[model samples]
Target: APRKGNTLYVYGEDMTPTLLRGAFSPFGNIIDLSMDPPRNCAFVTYEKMESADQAVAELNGTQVESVQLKVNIARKQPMLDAATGKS
Candidate 1:
């Protein structure tokens, strides 16, 4: 499922929530930032989709904290109906 909001998926060599937050906070009001340290990836949500788009345009493929980051619009997972086994 594709997400329909202003969230970005970021992949990098080494990432932390605090580090990503500090690096991305300048773009806009962040709604949430989640990091998977083991995977070196993070999800950043902004208050506005425009801000997220801007960040993707300006910051994607840029180096941060000594690692180049791959950033893109996050795909929203479809809401699953557990009872019906459908989305």
Candidate 2:
């Protein structure tokens, strides 16, 4: 499924969705937050592009609870269908 708005790719060690929300909620309204514990990464979707931009600017390379977070614009994934073999 396509994302609704700007999304951020966040990475860090020992991070949780609750921690991500607490750390990022101050910057904007989060539409959705998905965490991957095995990958130690998370995706945060914001209500606006500017908010995501601000989050990237302010949170990237910043430390949270002793763990440094890597924040960046989430790259769009190519959508493919088995029948068409196209994105």
Candidate 3:
């Protein structure tokens, strides 16, 4: 789940070196892990959809720290499991 309002996650290993180097935030705020990483994933949060849109528009296909970027908007999912505790 998003930490605050108007926020989402960012995930992508294709741009790991740059993200780890700390240069991708100029586009948005880095929310703590809403997903796993080092496997091409991250969690980002923006104040407005425009911010997210801007990120998608500008960051996609752009190179960061010499690596190409691939960005995708996060989707909503159930917070529970389908089976019972004894499944």
TM-score for all predictions?
A: 0.71, 0.75, 0.52
Expressed as tens digits, the lDDT of each residue in 1-87 for candidate 3 is: 233323344545553445532543675554433445555666555544555566767766677556566677665322321112332
Model 2 residue 4 distance off true place after TM-score fit, in angstroms: 3.9
Clashes of each: 2, 0, 8
| Model 1 segments more than 4 A misplaced | 1-5, 77-87
Error of 2 at 70 (Å): 0.6
Q: For model 2, what is the alpha-carbon lDDT of residue 5?
A: 47
**Winning model by lDDT:** 2
Instruction: Report the candidate with higher TM-score, 1 versus 2.
Output: 2
List the lowest-lDDT window of 10 residues for candidate 3: 76-85
Q: Write the per-residue lDDT of candidate 1 for residues 27-62, one digit (tens) a residue.
A: 876766677777777887766566676787887868
lDDT digits (tens) for residues 4-85 of candidate 2: 4456789899787787897779988887677878888898877666677678789886886576888876664222110121
